[PDB]
Amino acid sequence: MSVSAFNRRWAAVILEALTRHGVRHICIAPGSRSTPLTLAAAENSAFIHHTHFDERGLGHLALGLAKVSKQPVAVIVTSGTAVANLYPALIEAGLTGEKLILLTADRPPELIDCGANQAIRQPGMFASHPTHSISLPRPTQDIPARWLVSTIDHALGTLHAGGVHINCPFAEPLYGEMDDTGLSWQQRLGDWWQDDKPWLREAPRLESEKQRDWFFWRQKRGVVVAGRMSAEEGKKVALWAQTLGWPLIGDVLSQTGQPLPCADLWLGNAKATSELQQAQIVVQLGSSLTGKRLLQWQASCEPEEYWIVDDIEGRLDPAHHRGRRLIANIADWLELHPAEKRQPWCVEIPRLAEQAMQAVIARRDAFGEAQLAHRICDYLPEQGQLFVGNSLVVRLIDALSQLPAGYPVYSNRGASGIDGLLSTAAGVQRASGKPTLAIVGDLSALYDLNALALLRQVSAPLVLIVVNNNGGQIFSLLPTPQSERERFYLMPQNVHFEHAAAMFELKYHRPQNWQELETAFADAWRTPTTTVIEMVVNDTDGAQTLQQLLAQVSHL
Amino acid sequence: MSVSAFNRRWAAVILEALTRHGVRHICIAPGSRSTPLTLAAAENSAFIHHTHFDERGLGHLALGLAKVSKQPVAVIVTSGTAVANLYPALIEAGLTGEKLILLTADRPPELIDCGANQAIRQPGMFASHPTHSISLPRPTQDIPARWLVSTIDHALGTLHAGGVHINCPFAEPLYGEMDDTGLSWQQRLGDWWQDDKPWLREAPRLESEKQRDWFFWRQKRGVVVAGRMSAEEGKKVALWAQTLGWPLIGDVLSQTGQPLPCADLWLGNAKATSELQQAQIVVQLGSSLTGKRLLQWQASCEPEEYWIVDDIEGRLDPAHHRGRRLIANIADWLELHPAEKRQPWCVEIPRLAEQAMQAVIARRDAFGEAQLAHRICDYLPEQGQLFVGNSLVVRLIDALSQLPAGYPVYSNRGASGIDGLLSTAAGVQRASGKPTLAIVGDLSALYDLNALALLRQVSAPLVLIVVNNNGGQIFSLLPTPQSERERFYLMPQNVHFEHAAAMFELKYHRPQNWQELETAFADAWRTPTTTVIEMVVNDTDGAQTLQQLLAQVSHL
């Protein structure tokens, strides 16, 4: 008889099913309509439970979790605009591949389009952005549990990457006594409840075949571009490229070690671009390439074929080159297409890359964001991970430093949003347990401000560098019109973060030089908490230093 | 020739066209892709420009503006998750009628699903939540300006209520000199550029017909239920119900003056409900009724007829009574269905309503949220406006105080989200220019924390009361389960707002008695600046006081 009790039994099947697909982490926002989902999750000891009050934050927390653990991470939210806040993190997931299982509570069909409070049209509301969309029916004992677990099984079994959105109508009485309504119904699943596999096993592998002409292509004048990939993938790619004798352009996100550093600088030099005109094939592994000069070279170069090896799906070359798009695990792929010993063919690029770095070393003293980015390894935590925020920071680290091979870097570099960086960071460190360094801009920090709440619960030191250049200074770098740049572009907020840290009880440091920055780090890494280091810098110095260094290099 | 210059030409046609439909406020977030729209907006002298860095807050700021002004308000954002953030405000607008014109910038078609940075598929991404979706084509001179303005003219001309999503591909060379490409193409529109009406006027009106059996019905035992309507409509409805001799159950949002106050209390009393069983007809004006007892009585009652009169569309009875759904401006409808002076048929309800308010007044003294709610009248600015947050506050002011007839009230009571209350308040005050009192919960305040940024800029004094009962205390009033309530429901963040206030250079108080609250307000209505008043209150007291007042009143 009890609707209250049955809703929970319905929800218990949902959650148990996700358990069979490697879902450990679950992110929960407060609600009433979500009561069946939340209580089922709460009482299921397979989960590690995370909670937060801002649903946009909640999505990004889940996104950081899935980013690092490579596992499907679940999200429970209540009906209404709560669901709509998951949209940004879902979008990023859909572009970078994080498996997010969004379980969104709903009013039941009777309470739709009739002025019911906090009742909206939720089925379909993320359009094409989920990989799978399940819109569950009203819960009824007339639909057997086997269908409910099968539906979920298929969605998860076949999920290569990106998000699944499972809309969960519940009618209400939501609370009440657990009388054993639906226990019978649940029992038709038999000992599946004691099993560790899913009910229906459906896991087709999606993968491109061996390139049988690889033995031919591996001998051409090639170039290796390396975008976003795993830390270990980064090392493998470096040795591979080296063996071929092909120049490797490694992104900040590559973790290759960057044997030809300051690509964003040297690629702007005619000697480099014309040397590369000799490249017969370009093999790019991973994507989301950072620098302007890399994108621009890429968009303009004309090899015989262009390859992109990556674990995600769909076309990845925005310049649409003739070539191949190869779906694979990068490490697997490298083993399936091993490098072969060849003499290098580049003469000028190794030279320019060295000079480029030197021009930057020559500028390392000024206490500016350009320099912080140059010097950033100095500050990497031992056995840690770097989280790079968006806008100027990622561009400057990519252009001016040479990150160590196999040192973990993480970013939200799919949609490049500045909406969820702090909570994504929270996820990232939570996932792995590692000491974590996260560097972010001032608007970025202002955007995801309340995420500082999550930053009270960290398992290893997290250092949050907020670079404060009073506004979105990237729009200084781009050729924006002078007269409406302050108001409509930069949007300085004229604020500091001392009071932010105070509010949430985090250590704060506002260093005036390098000696003070190192002493802030020394204290920070001592304790499994989050320290906020505000780096206040002159608004336009970073962008100008980049432009100058670009110009300098382009004359060498 | 110049794509740059034409992007801007195209955009200015769009923005100019909005001009002819009373769009005067415009809300801009920072970005590169949105350049054509933003620059066109900036140079167009019709618009009052508003800016913010958080796009979710931006949407809600526009919601605020559109709410008060009852004009269409435009929003510009850039491509990527920026767009996705408009969702919450858009869902709200869709339910309550605010006219939000979302001009969302987008990459051109060549750059979608090809690994291009910050490119996602936007056309259709709000599903069916917009009233119209204009998905614009790639800008070209081969499509006449008369098409562009006409498409915008149609969507805006026909717009009864809710948002229009206008997606705007712009191909890049976004910056460049402003040569005279597409001037010739603009001129094909002739002297329309000096006109003040639309190019295509298509403005059909949507109305219900005169109810020609009204003279029959107005003599039966009727009940007037009044929900969200304008402040002038509240006064009229009070005059009307009084004349007919029908009891008026009036919501916080109604501005009717509430002449049977504390309905949430007296509707729980059996004598009141049985007297209401004699109701032959129920005429509700407006919608989104607040309280449980009203929502519950409304659900259960069985009058021969049930009428809902509101200028929004669709069904508004979540109990789906046999009756009438009349789409009309309330002020107009009342004139078209005038009252006739008649002897009030209710006997005990007035007595119960008085005794209920007395029960409440007898409890005014304790320094807590329930008591703040009850006496909020005392703090209302002269010639000002109220903005009520969600959760416990709106429930408490509806239950425990009697707001003045005609004194303007506003809320986000469609989807009842807690995600945009401060930024909505901002736009609410900005639209009217009136001194504003806005009260909100702690988690509410945290959710929209960065909106404190906008509150630095206020055309009249704004007081923001933040009730801090350490968590979502509504889940203390709802019969949620014991051992998982704090963690999965209330989610206390153990925090204050002194520092938040400080960060954003806003005056802060934290009164500890009625006197200290009076001193906080002495200063608060003089200067056109924002004052934060944090009300620290025992977590659980509000909920229990309501519960007790409920129990006390049912015994009358």
Ligand SMILES: Cc1ncc(C[n+]2csc(CCOP(=O)(O)OP(=O)(O)O)c2C)c(N)n1
């Ligand atoms: C959600 C979202 N909105 C807007 C943008 C456009 N955008 C890119 S960078 C930027 C400004 C970043 O400001 P800040 O954190 O101060 O970084 P800085 O420009 O100084 O590197 C904006 C608004 C975006 N990427 N994501």
Ligand SMILES: Cc1ncc(C[n+]2csc(CCOP(=O)(O)OP(=O)(O)O)c2C)c(N)n1
């Ligand atoms: C965007 C959104 N997420 C979640 C909810 C569900 N919800 C309704 S009330 C509430 C708690 C509000 O807490 P607070 O601001 O402290 O007010 P209090 O409960 O103490 O009145 C929540 C989470 C919602 N309405 N909107």
Ligand SMILES: [Cl-]
């Ligand atoms: Cl809820």
Ligand SMILES: [Cl-]
């Ligand atoms: Cl159904």
Ligand SMILES: [Cl-]
């Ligand atoms: Cl960026």
Ligand SMILES: [Cl-]
């Ligand atoms: Cl700390």
Ligand SMILES: [Cl-]
């Ligand atoms: Cl942009």
Ligand SMILES: [Cl-]
């Ligand atoms: Cl609410």
Ligand SMILES: [Cl-]
């Ligand atoms: Cl100042």
Ligand SMILES: [Mn+2]
């Ligand atoms: Mn900045």
Ligand SMILES: [Mn+2]
């Ligand atoms: Mn609260």
